[PDB]
Curated annotation (Swiss-Prot), chains A, B, C, D, E, F, G, H, I, J, K, L, M, N:
Result after altering residue 62 to A: Abolishes homooligomerization
GO BP terms: activation of innate immune response; apoptotic process; apoptotic signaling pathway; cellular response to interleukin-1; cellular response to lipopolysaccharide; cellular response to tumor necrosis factor; defense response to Gram-negative bacterium; defense response to Gram-positive bacterium
Tissue expression from the record: Widely expressed at low levels. Detected in peripheral blood leukocytes, lung, small intestine, spleen, thymus, colon and at lower levels in placenta, liver and kidney. Very low expression in skeletal muscle, heart and brain. Expressed in lung epithelial cells (at protein level). Detected in the leukemia cell lines HL-60 and U-937, but not in Jurkat T-cell lymphoma and Daudi Burkitt's lymphoma. Detected in the melanoma cell line WM35, but not in WM793. Not detected in HeLa cervical carcinoma cells and MOLT-4 lymphocytic leukemia cells.
Outcome following mutation: residue 8 to A: Abolishes homooligomerization
Keyword terms of this UniProt record: Apoptosis, Cytoplasm, Endoplasmic reticulum, Golgi apparatus, Immunity, Inflammasome, Inflammatory response, Innate immunity, Isopeptide bond, Membrane, Mitochondrion, Nucleus, Phosphoprotein, Tumor suppressor, Ubl conjugation
The name this protein goes by in its record: Apoptosis-associated speck-like protein containing a CARD
Outcome of mutating residue 20 to A: Abolishes homooligomerization
Top-level taxon: Eukaryota
Keyword set includes Endoplasmic reticulum: yes
Transferase as UniProt keyword: no
Length: 91, 91, 91, 91, 91, 91, 91, 91, 91, 91, 91, 91, 91, 91
């Protein structure tokens, strides 16, 4: 088990209830590269942090997941945990 | 065999719980073309999206089932799902 | 997918509690184009801004949804942040 | 089978949570004509409006249930929804 | 749907706190014609102007609502917005 | 079955929050006649008006409940609503 | 319901602050008929004129309430205003 | 088969899970006359109302079951619906 | 259960709101006998008069609560309120 | 079997959640005598009054459970409920 | 964001508590450009200078708001502070 | 088990929602020695005092929780309640 | 707990709104002993005498707080109230 | 985490309610360099000082947040506590 599955989940556990749903809604419209699908919306409106992390690390690998979450956090206004996430992923 | 069984799938996979029950409840009252039966009341209120797609593609053919769900989608006001679904259907 | 969902949300994120209440109340009587239903009252009076975005998108696409929100905002007095909304939607 | 499945859904979906419970509790004492029984209390006290439509159409025929709901609404003070639904049902 | 809902809410938006509660209290004793109930008191003393518009149009018909509000406003002394209200509603 | 179900109904929604809590607190101390126990306190501090009616009618007779509510009602000061409750229940 | 609720409030708006609280304080010591309670002090020490009228209606009906306010207003010196008050109430 | 199997069961469907839970909990402590055992603890705490009635009528005959249910409902606070139960049982 | 719950009650709504904070501030400091604890301070800063009565009856029985209320009420110099309260309580 | 099973029963529905939660929290810290374990940490924080009653009676003796509940109730300040329950248990 | 929202702010806190009232009422009669609504009275007659600036910038354009404020302040007679604020605005 | 479970919890419900907010706010900022992790804020900003004590004892033993609470409470100025806190701790 | 809570209370009873303002403002500059913080400005500038006593005893020892109060009243030249307060506090 | 979490908090409770609102108002227009977004306005104008600092850290990092707060506090006029906070920041 790569440590990346952990260094990402700790990021979501400091996000409040009012903002995590904003995050997950924003996830529906984030840009995607070629060869990668999107999580279905019907299941989308159901996860908490841990199982959402599970499906992100499943459909997306550790790397592209890391950068996509970093970018989307930077988009929504928070770059602070984005910075430490960047540091943890890059090293 | 037309891949529409997957189109109806991700069409149903992108929609949540409070509206899928509305979907099936409306399916009990939508008009049906001749030569076609209606799904029995006994079990219908229990199966998931997967089994729903399975039965609709079994009893009804791909075009008829797809257009039926499509009309139901415009019935609830959901056209964006219906639009991409019809896009997948006609071509 | 279209970045309109990404754009529109910012408008509702910059309104007070009573402002969005007036918004949703006026939404019940706005004119509608042919073939478009209206969101039911019992639901709309409970969800927040982002959920309201989700349902308006599910009912109205990027173009019609954007224009109708712009019309409502121009009706209620905000022509300015609606101005950047319509500017972003156009390009 | 009667189309009344939709209008009754249309009525229940635009009414708030505080008044749907008023509806269901008032259903316990509305007069009932011959040949019909009254819905058990315990089951209804947790189930939603659409399933309520389901059982009321099951035990009571669509027309009778329609005027029953209309009588409850004019009893509880809602007139315009009652009028629109009775217009849909009568013709 | 009828534009009269807006013609009521916009009129009530220029009423001050002592004005609106005096309006609401006199509403408890205004004469009512046959076939129409009265708003319950306990909840009435809590919700705001827009909520009040919703309830009055729910209990009373948008036309009938227009005349009853016009009557009560003329009764309480303010004749200006009564005039603009009747002008807007009549056509 | 007796209309005491909705006869008492309008009684609670014509009195607002600060006195309905007084109502239930009085209920903890009003004397009870033989063969009937007192409602558990933990549930009373959480039920609303409708749940209050449901519990009191379930545990106390529609008649006996009518006299109980009337007595506690004019005991706390309100005789008028107790007035039409007297009128409706006893006739 | 009786017009008295309107016929009473008309007394309180033509009189300014120092005498309304004098009426207020005299209310604590006025004689009461049997079977009638008195407004709680700390509760009464907060409302305005219209809420005071509502409280008077809550404990006292149109007849006894109007009579007692008329008697007190006569007692406190202002004789004419009680004049048109009793004129409106008697017929 | 006696119709008492149906008679008793009508009591269960108007009792939701909470009072159902206290009912089944008290069942482990209700008084027992000679010649009668008690329902096993393991099967009790998970089983639905219909099967509760089934083992009620198997372990205990129609009469003993009738009075034990009447007594336990009276103990838990419901004597009205228990009242019609006992009225049906005696005649 | 003693009517002191009703008795103590009417004392708190006959005292001004500016006083009740001084009331509770003294209550969190008055001497107590053995075997009885003191109210959690943070909660009493948010309870109302009714909730204050509820808590004092919950921790202290009707009697001891009566003497403590009398002692604190005479301590602040309020002679009339203390006299009427003790007259109600002692007999 | 011992009727304290019922007594401790209504020792809990007379109190609501926010004191129930601190009660069950202190149950993790109440003194334990020899031969008795403690309720497991994982499950304890999840069930309602009835279920925790079941577990405490299974783990602990009716006399032992009753006395420990009395002690912890005295610890949290509720004295009169403790007194009546201990009166029931002793005789 | 334009400094015009700020540029009005400092120009307003040197306006005494009485003349902001006449300023507010005068705002209800100022000429308005087409496509622009008028600020609601019920709100406007209650906020301070800060919130008045907030809603005037929201409803009216920052350039438009600045010029209209300069015009109206010139209308009442003040030329010095009006001159400095307009000088700050245009350049 | 150490009695600090109570000795901490009692320090919290005797202070209102305002100060516990800055308490929990500083908790994610106070220094930690090595080997001890920090409670996530995402769950933190929605818990009560009880759950706060629970997680503090979970992550940190009774002693370390005791001194951290004492020191942070000193930081926010409360020296006396914290005073009996250490008085309980060392002895 | 110390009676110093009560005395300081009526140490403030004869202070006018103007002198208590001078009191609190000079409390912002009085020297303090080590181990004690300074009162937050925004909070003090809105609290009353009672809340001021609450905060000062919360942060400063009853002995320490009483000595500081004696000192500050001595600073302003207030001799009589300071003398009686210090006489009460010392013994 | 950097201590600046409280080094900003202490700068907020020492200023009154009348000026924190115009502080957050000015925050709506502060200059921002690239990579830094602006807090949504609607949610902004409802938070307190603590939540204000929370999103100050959430949107902007420690040094950036501290310097922007220093600049804005210099801009609004207060020079003393601004110097205090900046002195706390740099060293």
């Amino acid at each position: 088990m790569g440590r990346a599955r952990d260094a990402i989940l700790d990021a979501l556990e400091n996000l409040t209830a009012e903002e995590l749903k904003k995050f997950k809604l924003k996830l529906l419209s984030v840009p995607l590269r070629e060869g990668y699908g999107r999580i279905p919306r019907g299941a989308l409106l159901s996860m908490d942090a841990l199982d959402l992390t599970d499906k992100l690390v499943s459909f997306y690998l550790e790397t592209y997941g890391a950068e996509l979450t970093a970018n989307v956090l930077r988009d929504m206004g928070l770059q602070e945990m984005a910075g430490q996430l960047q540091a943890a992923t890059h090293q």
